[PDB]
């Protein structure tokens, strides 16, 4: 084998300073600083990562197109589809229930 | 279970700390690590996630409770009293 | 250390320029010098 080092300093493996060793076309085993992996954006009520939305870091999410970011269906990446449905049912039925109360009262 | 004679779940403590304290710890830990029945979905998966908070895994929901068990006798009595009045 | 400050770098370059020996012609019409190992700039 051989030894290697960072070309950007910061040789300790921090949160941001992670590294992938790589062999070159020159046959030289070198080190490359690997891009920072992340957790995932979350549904508002359930805190659940959403289908159809890519998990891109905010620089890549700025460069990414709008089709990659979000879903046409209802309230997009805000809340998940099953969760939306139940909330819609609750909102409708409670208005119905309210209307029944109004009819009852007079 | 079929390992220790009397220390049971406090056998991890066994070589350290006073025996009576280990008895006291045993009672509290038995309550502490129990999996409670969930009022908000009917399964016995309700676990403590931090001191006052007992979360159901299945319906993903946080009930506020006692330190070592789901409910104090005091709170139950108070709840009952309010319904009574 | 390895990275530097513009003011410090300039003063150090000055001190180096001052360090170099006297013109020999001046004696035809050298009291102070520093050596890096035994005398530091004291900054």
């Amino acid at each position: 084998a051989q030894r290697v080092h960072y070309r950007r300093h910061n040789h300790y493996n921090t949160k941001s300073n992670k590294v992938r060793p790589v062999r070159t076309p020159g046959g030289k085993l070198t080190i490359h600083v690997v891009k920072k992996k992340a957790g995932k954006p979350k549904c508002a009520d359930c805190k659940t990562a959403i289908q159809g939305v890519k998990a891109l870091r905010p620089a890549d999410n700025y460069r990414a197109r709008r089709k990659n970011r979000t879903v046409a269906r209802a309230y997009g990446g805000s809340i998940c589809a099953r969760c939306i449905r139940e909330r819609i049912m609750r909102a409708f039925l409670f208005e119905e229930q309210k209307c029944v109360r109004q009819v009852l009262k007079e | 279970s079929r390992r220790t004679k009397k220390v049971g779940l406090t056998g991890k403590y066994g070589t350290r700390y006073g025996s009576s304290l280990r008895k006291q710890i045993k009672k509290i830990e038995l309550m502490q690590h129990a999996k409670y029945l969930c009022t908000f979905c009917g399964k016995t998966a309700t676990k403590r996630t931090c001191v006052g908070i007992w979360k159901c895994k299945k319906c993903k929901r946080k009930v506020c409770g006692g330190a070592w068990s789901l409910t104090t006798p005091a709170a139950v009595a108070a709840k009952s009293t309010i319904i009574r009045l | 250390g390895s990275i530097k400050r513009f003011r410090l770098k300039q003063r150090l370059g000055k001190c180096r320029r001052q360090n170099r020996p006297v013109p020999h012609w001046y004696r035809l019409k050298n009291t102070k010098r520093r050596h890096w190992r035994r005398t530091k700039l004291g900054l």
């Binding site: - | 001191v51 006052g52 908070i53 506020c64 409770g65 070592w68 104090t72 709170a75 009293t81 309010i82 | -």
Partner: protein, 247 residues
Amino acid sequence: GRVIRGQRKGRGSIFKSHNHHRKGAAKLRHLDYCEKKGYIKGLVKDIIHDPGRGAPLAKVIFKRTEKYGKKEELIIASEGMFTGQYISCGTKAPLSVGNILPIGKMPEGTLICNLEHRTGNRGTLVKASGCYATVVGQSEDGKKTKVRLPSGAKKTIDAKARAMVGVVGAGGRIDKPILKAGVAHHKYRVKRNCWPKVRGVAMNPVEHPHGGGNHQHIGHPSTVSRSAPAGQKVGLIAARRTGLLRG
């Protein structure tokens, strides 16, 4: 001599409280016109742990009465509170657990928590885990109300002042004994600079007045007057009775 540790504590320094883990001040809803005349219902959206407080905080959403949109409060979580629980606050609010009501509108012998010493002071009393106050009487011509502090003490406050139905969460916390010195360290790490708590009698008399003596004598009364100087107030100040409590 050299300044005693309790006197040194008030110089501020490294004896300021460890607030990093702590999620904000735990004061209740402020009094307003809507609370005064009627009631507001809110929804408990999340329950969160604070380690400076003995019990959880509850994140409660109200909708802005003077404007538009959703506003978040931090309430102390009552035992039996849950995420998605509806909490009601105000004069005309119904009696139920965790509701926030003027003490005048409690029936006697009820159990309550988060009392305030004056209206709109936002729950200054009865805040510790598992704790509760009892309403012990209501004035005949109103205006005042008599309540019982968790010390067992009775006190009379105005009827208008609010409190929160039920008992504080995380009860029975003191029942478990402290396992070990590391557990005690973890407790003080989120509290205050206050530990290890070394004996005064062990030290030089110069640096703690219980100190000195070749075989670690006290050599003087351990019962001190409240009239004493601060550097003399090391012992048991205003001690009416000493020895083991009996009867």
